Structure 1
Amino acid sequence: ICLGHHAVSNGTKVNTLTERGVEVVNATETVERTNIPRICSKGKRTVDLGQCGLLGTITGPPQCDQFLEFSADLIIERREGSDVCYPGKFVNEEALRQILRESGGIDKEAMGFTYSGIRTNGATSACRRSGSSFYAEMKWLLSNTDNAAFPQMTKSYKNTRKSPALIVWGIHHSKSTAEQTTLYGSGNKLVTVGSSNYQQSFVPSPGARPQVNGLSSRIDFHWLMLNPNDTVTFSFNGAFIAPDRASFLRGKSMGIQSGVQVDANCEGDCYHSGGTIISNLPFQNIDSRAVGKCPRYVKQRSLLLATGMKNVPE
């Protein structure tokens, strides 16, 4: 009587501590390379922002009207998204983007500013709603009539709620000093914003800029988080795009950036711009910037784990 072990005609080669390309009876892959090219969103409240830029949900350019109070577990930004209608940009935009991706959505509430002695209905042909309009959550404050003086004014808001308030305001930079006076009157203009943990001043800077959407004038959007029971007070003399509502974060979510479709029929937890990584494998070689609950990215495309003995055929 003789003892022996099995072997097969065609095995699979693996690497060990002492030898590369040792043949074993069977092995299995540890590095995931297979991508499913869709955003697998089954079971998850999903918001596909589309042409709405994420920061736009706070200010409300026309492309974001359907997203002013969105609610979501998964947030998808698209390349065609725009935060603005009147050209401009947010200061510390990415920090704000990162805050909103994990927010779970936003809940709007009137901040309660009332005005006297000015126009409040500033509109532009860049934010069109069957006619000239503006950001839905803001108000473009102007002098009552052309070249009239904008009074120095102070408007305050108390966060009476239990979570921090997102307050956004804007600084208007006109196309020239002459255009800036026609909207707000001549002279240096200043907007001061202060809270219990914040202080910063702003003066508008009129000047020529390249035409974006037909305009050489621009708006700077600024923001702060107002703690519960804290007060934000705005002192301004013109060139101020005032907030109408404050934003409050709903809960928790995650944000991704994708160029692929939504699929409510696959379930996944690891996303990248090309789709979803669905895998029980501990490693992936697909995208080092994948987000969610993911296998660890590695540079190897393949790492074979022996699952059987050494193959020694005759």
Structure 2
Amino acid sequence: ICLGHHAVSNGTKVNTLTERGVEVVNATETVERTNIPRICSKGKRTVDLGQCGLLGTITGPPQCDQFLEFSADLIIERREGSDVCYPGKFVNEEALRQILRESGGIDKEAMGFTYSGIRTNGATSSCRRSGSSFYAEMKWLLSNTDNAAFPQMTKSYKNTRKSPALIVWGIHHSVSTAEQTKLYGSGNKLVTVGSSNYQQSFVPSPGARPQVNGLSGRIDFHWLMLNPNDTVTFSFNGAFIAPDRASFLRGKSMGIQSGVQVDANCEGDCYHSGGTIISNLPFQNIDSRAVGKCPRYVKQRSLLLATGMKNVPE
């Protein structure tokens, strides 16, 4: 009576502590390479921003009119998105983006600002709606007449809610100093925002810029986060885009950047720009910048784990 073990004619070579290419009976893969070229969003509140930029949802350009008070568990940024309609830029833009990606949506509230002795209906041809408009959440403050002066103003806002408020204002930079005198008058303009954690400090810089959307003027967007019962104060005398509504974070979510379509048929927690990684393997060799609940990225494209015995054929 002879006893032994099984064997196969064609095994699978694996690597061990000792050798390289040990032919075993059975083996399975541990490094995931299969990628689903879609954003698997089955069972999640998804907001595809599309042509709307993530920061725009706070200021409200025409492309973000349907994203002013969104709510989602998964936020998708697109490459065609734009934060601005009038050529501008955000200060500390990426930090605000990372804040809004995990915000779970935003909730707007009227700040309750009223004015006396100044105009307020500033508009432009780039922020187009019915005709010439502006940012839906902002107000372009100017001087009452086509020139004149700007009275030194001080407007205050107190956060009466239990969550931190997102306050965003804008400094204007016209094509020249003459246009600045046309909009707000001559003299040195100064904008001051102060609170409990904040302390600035804002002065305009007119000049000629490259024409974006046929416009050489720029708008600097700034933002601070008021704490509950904390009060913020603005002291401005021109070149000031006033905030009309403040934002409040709804809850929690995740933000990704992708260029593939949305699919509610598959479910996944690991996302990258090329799709969703659906796998139970502990490692993956698809994208080192994948976010969510992912297998850990490794440089090896394959690491075969032995599931059978040593294969010794006749």
SS state at 1:141 partner: strand
CA distance in 2, matches of 1:142, 1:93: 26
SS at match of 2:58: helix
Equivalents in 1 of 2:184, 2:203: separation in Å?
13
Distance (Å, rounded) in 1 between the aligned partners of 2:116 and 2:140: 14
Tell me, yes or no, if the aligned pair for 1:166 and 1:247 is still in contact at 8 Å. yes
**Partner Cα distance (1:234, 1:140) in 2:** 15
How far apart are residue 242 of structure 1 and its match? 0.3
Distance 2:289 2:111 in 1: 38
| Structure 1 ranges of 4+ moved more than 6 A | none
The alpha carbon displacement at 1:207 in A equals 0.1
What is the SS of the residue equivalent to 2:96?
A: helix
Task: Report if the CA contact (8 A) 1:272-1:290 is conserved.
Answer: yes
Shift of 1:280: 0.2
* Runs of at least 5 residues in structure 2 that lack an aligned partner in the other structure: none
1:114-151 Cα distance to aligned partner (Å, 9 max, x none): 00101110000010111000000000000011111010
Query: 1:41–1:263: 8 Å Cα contact kept in structure 2?
Result: yes
Which residue does 1:130 correspond to in 2? 130
Number of the residue aligned with 1:263: 263
Distance 1:228 1:269 in 2: 33
What SS does the aligned partner of 2:178 have? helix
* Deviation readout 1:126-183 (Å, 9 max, x if unpaired): 1011100000000000001111101000000000000000000000000000001100
Find the aligned partners of 1:122 and 1:218 in 2 and give their Cα distance.
14
Q: Are the aligned partners of 1:147 and 1:186 in contact in 2 as well (CA < 8 Å)?
A: no
Deviation at 1:5, TM superposition (A): 0.5
Matched, 1:311 2:307: no
Provide the C-alpha distance between the structure 1 equivalents of 2:121 and 2:230, rounded to a whole number of angstroms. Answer: 29
Q: Alignment partner of 1:189: what SS? A: coil
2:197 and 2:12 map into 1 onto residues whose CA distance is: 64
Please report the TM-score for the alignment, with normalisation by the length of structure 2: 1.00
CA drift at 1:197: 1.3
Alpha-carbon shift at residue 50 of structure 1 (Å): 0.2
Aligned-residue identity in percent: 99
**1: CA distance, partners of 2:21 / 2:128:** 66
Matches of 2:126 and 2:286, distance apart in 1: 41
Instruction: Give the RMSD, CA atoms, in angstroms.
Output: 0.4
Say if 1:195 and 1:232, in contact at 8 Å, map to a contact too. Answer: yes
Q: Distance in 1 between matches of 2:244 and 2:278?
A: 43
Name the count of aligned residue pairs.
Answer: 314
Segments of 5+ residues of structure 1 without an aligned counterpart are none
The alpha carbon displacement at 1:229 in A equals 0.2
Q: In the TM superposition, what are the counterparts of 1:178-217 in structure 2 within 5 Å?
A: 178-217=178-217
Contact 1:45 1:72 in 2 (8 A): yes
CA distance in 2, matches of 1:232, 1:61: 25
- Structure 1 residues 189-231: Cα deviation after superposition (integer angstroms, max 9, x where no partner): 0000000111011111000000001110100000000000000
Secondary structure of 2:305 counterpart:
strand
CA positional deviation for 1:102: 0.3
